[PDB]
């Protein structure tokens, strides 16, 4: 059931912005590790005396890395005279965010028809304002409201190239890396209490609960009208044998924040080959692979969807597989992206639900908590 | 002339420590960009609840990357009960350093016979204490005094593996990269006033001025007894046509600090091939190459030292060449290592001065200011 109750017209995930201490080093690491091309910049070389911002792209996926310069460079500016390309940016907010949380996501940006209207309606329906709508060069409107913790939901809308004041990156420094990642599938928050977080966000968006079919968490998913903007939220379950990983997150993150970003690949096998090649030479590590019993058990679970060779390829790469009543999901998780055991990345590919492919086809892999548990006890023998 | 006036016995550069916002991402970028192996760690997985510290090595060169965790993880500790592996580390100092200066060098560490004695004698001769001598697991003593700005000179001494509490890195995550870098040749500070900085440092070390043979700077070099610890210092020259790059440093760095690290390669040609291969896929960029007239002029300057093929190879890679009365220097400079136009890296190889090779053979390339200027006007034609 989908009541299509969005209170404003939402299109797609537009970008994810990381707040960094040094944007250069994070962006270059992420570019090599994920196969994303350097596409735009806003920094000293473009006249921005406030913040350094570098954009990586792979398909429709946009990762933005931003860090503050010394406030002294812009001490004479006021907001009417600012050289920042992102008017919501604040030196003090950025430094406090990074000191409190370490490296992580500041903004989940969705593209909307009308960012001023999206902001107004949101705030009229309980959203905590974070940055009022601002029109950039009469072409792009950007607005921000609080999502959870210190993460904002950012609305962007275009009259008709990333943002004004950003410049396309020079051909020489823009090496066309590509490991097959194409778009952001979903973005997941960790919170202390799922109920109040769900009520708040669903309250100002009109996003509906996405139908779902001892692990330390309860979770629910909010979705836009066409279920292409997907925002799951987790809360810890206390009192378990193994301490909840959601609670460990909240502790090391200093509270709520973005837990993982799930990136859709058009060929998860090639993506994982390419990423695993680079794990130990500057890229990303992956969680420990499931035992072979897990892949033995795949024949019964997904033998109508994956061949024996396609299953062996999953075993080669540590890929996980889960199933809805509608589709099949292949997924794998990286180790944390930075120093703290907080944010990580999920690579996914979905099979089925053709009409184009409907959002969320195959679910989010929650059946893999049980199957992993079973397979490890089965492998123990 | 070398009076060998060291006030304590100094051995060699031991390591360079960067203070970071996220040590993971800087270290992984540096590892790939410079061909340095992950060798040791001190972090949550080793019981360190205070800071994440990752060590990269290439030959004798040691780069340490450190960032603070949330203070809440260690809120119950006191210095007698600390889990930090580096007792001088302070959350507030690290955050203030990084917020003020961005990514850069906090510690220039030299190995000495006796770090307690080195500290005491230093302070008795005017050094500003920064961290008193502390004995780690009865095996290693570490002490720190102020060098310039917020950079410390760190003394380390061993009774007889990097530091106690650091663990050797797992074979799988320790990929044996190597582009030919072997040791730190020199470490260079930028200051507002060269005279008072020279007097201070030479005053508490007994380091002597290293003999030297419109560019925007004045500089001098301090050296240990065998001239293997080399610490040049720059000050800006004001009132030039082109604004001094030293002054630009001081402005963007919020004052004095480490300007560049010069890394000796045992094969500068292979190092630069390997680094330039990776410039646009996560590694380091290099300053713009000199005009072809510069390499035409190399035949007259160094034709007795480099063949025509070895010169063409310099032109291929943008390598610079300078000459002492004693030796020849090949050098090249990276673009800034991070967001701000502050710290950069120099790759060098020295030819001559065999006895082993004496320190500083060939100088520091100050003749290349004139030769670059000449060659660009010559290329203009
Ligand atoms: C993130 C994630 C998802 C996911 O995407 C997600 C949503 O998108 C929607 C909300 C529910 C939800 O979880 C699905 C399955 C997962 C994981 C996962 O993170 N992990 C490792 C956990 C782990 C493992 C070992 C020790 C610790 Cl402390 C912790 C798993 O095993 N599975 C099976
Ligand atoms: C760092 C450096 C050295 C060096 O190692 C050093 C010491 O170790 C000892 C003290 C003197 C000293 O300088 C030598 C030569 C250099 C550079 C250099 O940095 N540069 C680029 C500068 C530059 C160029 C263009 C615009 C701007 Cl704003 C700025 C050069 O050209 N040469 C020729
Ligand atoms: Co997920
Ligand atoms: Co130098």
Asked whether A122 and A145 are in contact (CB, 8 A), the reply is yes
Q: Which residues pair with B67 in a beta bridge?
A: B52
Looking at the structure, do residues B229 and B140 belong to the same domain, yes or no?
no
Looking at the structure, do residues B351 and B373 belong to the same domain, yes or no?
yes
C-alpha distances in Å from residue B317, one per residue of A118, B182, B295, B333, B347: 53, 19, 11, 11, 12
Question: If 0-12 CB within 10 Å is exposed, 13-18 middle and 19+ buried, where does residue A158 land?
Answer: middle
Pairing of strands A151-158, A104-112: parallel
Asked whether A289 and A376 are in contact (CB, 8 A), the reply is no
- Domain finish residue from A150, A173, A196: A173
Closest to B250 (Cα-Cα) out of B262, B238, B240: B238
Please enumerate in sequence order all residues whose Cβ is within 8 A of that of B27, keeping only pairs 6 or more positions apart, or say none.
B38, B54, B56, B63, B65
Distance CA B66, CA B95 (A): 11
Query: Around Cβ A6, how many Cβ atoms within 10 Å?
Result: 19
Residues with CB under 5 A from ligand 4 (ion): B 262, 346, 364
Distance CA A290, CA A53 (A): 38
The encoded tokens of residue A128 equal 């905590």
Distance CA A339, CA A335 (A): 10
Closest to A152 (Cα-Cα) out of A127, A135, A186: A127
**Domain containing A96: what range?**
10-173
Count of CA atoms in the C-beta half-sphere (13 A) of B74:
24
φ, ψ of residue A125 in degrees (nearest 5) = -110, 25
C-alpha distances in Å from residue B225, one per residue of A37, A276, B106: 49, 48, 24
Resolution in angstroms, to 1 decimal, for this deposition? 2.0
CA distance B339 to chain A (A): 5
Looking at the structure, do residues B249 and B128 belong to the same domain, yes or no?
no
Asked whether A255 and A246 are in contact (CB, 8 A), the reply is no
Asked whether B140 and B159 are in contact (CB, 8 A), the reply is yes
Q: Which residue in A18, A20, A21 has the most chain B C-beta atoms within 10 A of its own C-beta, making it the best mutation to test that interface?
A: A21
Does residue A2 belong to any structural domain of this protein?
no
Asked whether A53 and A47 are in contact (CB, 8 A), the reply is no
The encoded tokens of residue A209 equal 């609960």
Does residue A1 belong to any structural domain of this protein?
no
**A335: nearest CA in chain B?**
B24
C-alpha distances in Å from residue A75, one per residue of A67, A173, A206, B248: 17, 31, 41, 16
- Domain finish residue from B124, B148, B173: B173
Looking at the structure, do residues A235 and A167 belong to the same domain, yes or no?
no
Looking at the structure, do residues A364 and A228 belong to the same domain, yes or no?
yes
C-alpha A154, offset from chain centre: 13
Tokens 């090496």 -> residue? A175
The encoded tokens of residue B303 equal 């034709």
List residues near ligand 1 (CB under 6 A).
A 186, 188, 219, 232, 234, 245, 260, 262, 333, 346, 364-366, 368-369, 372
DSSP state of B243: P
C-alpha A175, offset from chain centre: 23
- Domain finish residue from A123, A153, A173: A173
Looking at the structure, do residues B225 and B315 belong to the same domain, yes or no?
yes
Please enumerate in sequence order all residues whose Cβ is within 8 A of that of B52, keeping only pairs 6 or more positions apart, or say none.
A339, B23, B24, B42, B43, B44, B66, B67, B69
Distance CA A247, CA A259 (A): 11
Closest to A184 (Cα-Cα) out of A112, A263, A105: A263
Q: How many domains does chain B have?
A: 2
DSSP state of B103: S
Pocket test for ligand 1, best of A248, A359, A366 (most atoms within 8 A of CB): A366
Does residue B5 belong to any structural domain of this protein?
no
Print burial letters for A63-87: b (CB count within 10 Å at least 16), e (below 16): bbbbbbbbbebbeeeeeeeebbbbb
Looking at the structure, do residues B167 and B312 belong to the same domain, yes or no?
no
**The dihedral formed by the CA atoms of A33, A52, B18 and B74, expressed in degrees to the nearest 10:** -90
Question: What is the whole-number distance in angstroms between the Cα of residue A246 and the centre of ligand 1?
Answer: 10
φ, ψ of residue A264 in degrees (nearest 5) = -80, 130
Question: What is the whole-number distance in angstroms between the Cα of residue A251 and the centre of ligand 1?
Answer: 17
The encoded tokens of residue A119 equal 């902001």
Please enumerate in sequence order all residues whose Cβ is within 8 A of that of A377, keeping only pairs 6 or more positions apart, or say none.
none
Distance CA B329, CA B302 (A): 10
Please enumerate in sequence order all residues whose Cβ is within 8 A of that of A344, keeping only pairs 6 or more positions apart, or say none.
A259, A260, A333, A334, A335, A336, A337
Q: Report the greatest alpha carbon distance in chain A.
A: 70
Closest to B212 (Cα-Cα) out of B353, B346, B364, B4: B364
Question: If 0-12 CB within 10 Å is exposed, 13-18 middle and 19+ buried, where does residue B43 land?
Answer: buried
Asked whether A191 and A148 are in contact (CB, 8 A), the reply is yes
Helices (H) and strands (E) in chain B, counts: 10, 17
Q: Which atom of ligand 1 is nearest to the CA of A243?
A: 28
**Cβ contact B43–A339 (<8 Å):** yes
Asked whether A79 and A43 are in contact (CB, 8 A), the reply is no
B21 touches chain A (CB under 8 A): yes
Asked whether A118 and A206 are in contact (CB, 8 A), the reply is no
Distance CA B71, CA A300 (A): 48
Looking at the structure, do residues A317 and A187 belong to the same domain, yes or no?
yes
The encoded tokens of residue B330 equal 């090949």
3-state helix, strand, coil in chain B (%, to 5): 30, 35, 40
C-alpha B216, offset from chain centre: 21
Distance CA B308, CA B328 (A): 16
Kindly give the interhelix angle for B194-205 and B115-124, rounded to the nearest 10 degrees.
Answer: 130
Looking at the structure, do residues B203 and B75 belong to the same domain, yes or no?
no
Distance CA A199, CA A214 (A): 24
Please enumerate in sequence order all residues whose Cβ is within 8 A of that of A312, keeping only pairs 6 or more positions apart, or say none.
A295
Distance CA A19, CA A12 (A): 22
Distance CA A108, CA A103 (A): 15
Looking at the structure, do residues B245 and B291 belong to the same domain, yes or no?
yes
Does residue A4 belong to any structural domain of this protein?
no
Looking at the structure, do residues A169 and A198 belong to the same domain, yes or no?
no
| CATH at residue A308 | 3.10.180.10
**Cβ contact A28–B283 (<8 Å):** yes
Asked whether B21 and A21 are in contact (CB, 8 A), the reply is yes
A98 touches chain B (CB under 8 A): yes
Distance CA B164, CA B48 (A): 12
Distance CA B217, CA B233 (A): 10
Distance CA B119, CA B68 (A): 26
Closest to A349 (Cα-Cα) out of A375, A322, A369, A329: A329
Does residue A3 belong to any structural domain of this protein?
no
DSSP for A81-111 reads G---SSTT--HHHHHHHHHHH-SEEEEEEEE
Asked whether B189 and B259 are in contact (CB, 8 A), the reply is yes
Looking at the structure, do residues A283 and A368 belong to the same domain, yes or no?
yes
């Amino acid at each position: 059931k989908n009541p299509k109750s969005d209170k404003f017209k939402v299109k797609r995930f537009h970008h994810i912005e990381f707040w960094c201490g040094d944007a250069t080093n994070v962006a270059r690491r992420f570019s090599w590790g994920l196969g994303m091309r350097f596409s735009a910049k806003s920094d000293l070389s473009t006249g921005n005396m406030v913040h350094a911002s570098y954009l990586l792209t792979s398909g429709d996926l946009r990762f933005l890395f931003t860090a503050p310069y010394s406030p002294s460079l812009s001490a004479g500016e006021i907001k009417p005279t600012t050289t920042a390309s992102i008017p919501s940016f604040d030196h003090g907010s950025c430094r406090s965010f990074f000191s409190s949380h370490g490296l992580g996501v500041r903004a989940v940006a969705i593209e909307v028809e009308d960012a001023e209207s999206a902001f107004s309606i949101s705030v009229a329906n309980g959203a905590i304002p974070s940055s009022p709508p601002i029109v950039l060069n009469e072409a792009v409107t950007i607005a921000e409201v609080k999502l959870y913790g210190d993460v904002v939901l950012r609305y962007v809308s275009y009259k008709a190239e990333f943002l004004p004041g950003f410049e396309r990156v020079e051909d020489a420094s823009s090496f066309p890396l590509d490991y097959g990642i194409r778009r952001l599938d979903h973005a997941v928050g960790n919170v202390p209490e799922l109920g109040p977080a769900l009520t708040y966000v669903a309250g100002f968006t009109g996003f509906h609960q996405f139908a779902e079919f001892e692990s330390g968490l309860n979770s629910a998913v909010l979705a836009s009208n066409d279920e292409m903007v997907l925002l799951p939220i987790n809360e810890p379950v206390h009192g378990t044998k193994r301490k909840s990983q959601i609670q460990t997150y909240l502790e090391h993150n200093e509270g709520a924040g973005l837990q993982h970003l799930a990136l859709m690949s058009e060929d998860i096998f090639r993506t994982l080959r390419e990423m695993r090649k680079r794990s130990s030479i500057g890229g990303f590590d992956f969680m420990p692979s499931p035992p072979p019993t897990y892949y033995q058990n795949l024949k019964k679970r997904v033998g109508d969807v994956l061949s024996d060779d396609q299953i062996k390829e999953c075993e080669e790469l540590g890929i996980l597989v889960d199933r809805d009543d509608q589709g099949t999901l292949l997924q794998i998780f990286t180790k944390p992206l930075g120093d703290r055991p907080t944010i990580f990345i999920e690579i996914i590919q979905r099979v089925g639900c053709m009409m184009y492919q409907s959002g969320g086809c195959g679910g989010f892999g929650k059946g893999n908590f049980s199957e992993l548990f079973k397979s490890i006890e089965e492998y123990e023998k």
